[PDB]
Design a protein around this ligand. Structure first.
Ligand SMILES: *[C@@H]1O[C@H](CO)[C@@H](O)[C@H](O)[C@H]1NC(C)=O
Lengths: 205, 214
């Protein structure tokens, strides 16, 4: 089955460049154009350009023909997008997607989230939220960039940015007989700092 | 860059309701090169309808698409919860291909009151000089809700971060988290912390408190 696998989220400083990748599988790489699009949160899609891996020709939106460079490597069936001279406004989700019948876009990569900021990469501080069904939670504070994953042993809220640090929380609802007799632990991963936290939900006093 | 204007920008529908949404172009576009996508939060768009009226693989037959020239529409014969998403139109009559700013289709459902829980600062957090009080407001509908924080009965507006989930896939409710952050010094100078939710489901606020005496 067709699949486009994009590279992970990256944080980059303003002024620098970055290159993201889109590894294609399950079809003849050179037989189809791949397009690249930008989507800022809450907004629709903006087209950057496309790559034709058959002849290595790429075609650009006039707006991006300076900033963006699309390439591909036939041997690894990977397409690449380089964005240069990065600024805040380049922060967005970027998608690769395959060109199909009548230039419909039939298979999409999962998206690569780019964050452009001067802010320091910072691992989270994780705090237990302790008081028939009982709600527990954990507060994941003071981290940058996104994302964090939260796993228990459920409502996990989108992060909020303030003064270049994110705050996120997650709530879990178990029965009274479970906690505190059993261990309950929220497991936080922050891949950008290569950190995790195994926080035990401890009762107070 | 042909402008595509989608209407309505936002709309709600109950299970079973017929839904139609429109995409208007500033220039004529061939129907063969007009397509629709569905996108859910945190995930990639999927092709939904291609060449005006052909359903993409796996798209249920309650969807249909129509149009020509400058006026296109997507129709949902009977709304189901899995259909809540943003739908985007796409023209590739000219380069650069362009897309609409989307119709966000939400699920309407019966009102539901929030379940409210309040949590004091952990001693771990206090050890480092910070103090965050957290309030969860879980599984309520409609989205409109006013959380107020009170310290010894007096309203606090500064230092509050609020975050809403997207509609839940199963029950179509919203949840919300509210985090009041103070200094340890400020926190330790008051006794009671109160989270108050006003929501159309109760004439009274749903209130939770704790005091630094328990
Ligand atoms: C597109 O059409 C709308 C509505 O008639 C109009 O107000 C808008 O300015 C047009 N945009 C362009 C770029 O011509």
């Amino acid at each position: 089955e067709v699949k486009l696998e994009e590279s992970g989220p990256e944080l980059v400083k303003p002024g620098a460049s970055m290159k993201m990748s889109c590894k294609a599988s399950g079809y003849t790489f050179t037989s189809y154009i791949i397009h690249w699009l930008k989507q800022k949160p809450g907004q629709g899609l903006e087209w950057i350009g496309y790559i034709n891996p058959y002849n290595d020709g790429s075609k650009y939106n006039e707006k991006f023909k300076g900033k963006a460079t699309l390439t591909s490597d036939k041997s690894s069936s990977t397409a690449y997008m380089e964005l240069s001279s990065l600024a805040s406004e380049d922060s967005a989700v970027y998608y690769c997607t395959r060109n199909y019948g009548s230039d419909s876009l039939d298979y999409w990569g999962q998206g690569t989230t780019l964050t452009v900021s001067s802010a320091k990469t910072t691992p989270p501080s994780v705090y237990p939220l302790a008081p028939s069904m009982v709600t527990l939670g954990c507060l994941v504070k003071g981290y940058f960039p996104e994302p964090v994953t939260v796993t228990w042993n459920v409502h996990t809220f989108p992060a909020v940015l303030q003064s270049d640090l994110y705050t996120l929380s997650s709530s879990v609802t178990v029965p009274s007989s479970t906690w505190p007799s059993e261990t309950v632990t929220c497991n936080v991963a922050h891949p950008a700092s290569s950190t995790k936290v195994d926080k035990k939900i401890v009762p107070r006093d | 860059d042909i402008v595509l204007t989608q209407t309505p920008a936002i709309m709600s529908a109950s299970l079973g309701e017929r839904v139609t949404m429109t995409c208007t172009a500033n220039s004529s576009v061939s129907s063969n090169y007009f397509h629709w996508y569905q996108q859910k939060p945190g995930s990639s768009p999927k092709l939904w309808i291609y060449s005006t009226s052909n359903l993409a693989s796996g798209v249920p037959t309650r969807f249909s698409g129509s149009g020509s020239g400058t006026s296109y529409s997507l129709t949902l014969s009977s709304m189901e919860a899995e259909d809540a998403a943003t739908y985007y139109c796409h023209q590739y009559h000219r380069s650069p291909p362009t897309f609409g700013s989307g119709t966000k289709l939400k699920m309407k459902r019966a009102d539901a009151a929030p379940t409210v829980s309040i949590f004091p600062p952990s001693s771990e957090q206090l050890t480092s000089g910070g103090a965050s009080v957290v309030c969860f407001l879980n599984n309520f509908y409609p989205k409109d809700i006013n959380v107020k924080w009170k310290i010894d009965g007096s309203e606090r507006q500064n230092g509050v971060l609020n975050s809403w989930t997207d509609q839940d896939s199963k029950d179509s409710t919203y949840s919300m988290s509210s985090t009041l952050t103070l200094t340890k010094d400020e926190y330790e100078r008051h006794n009671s912390y109160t989270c108050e939710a006003t929501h159309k489901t109760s004439t009274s606020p749903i209130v939770k408190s704790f005091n630094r005496n328990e």
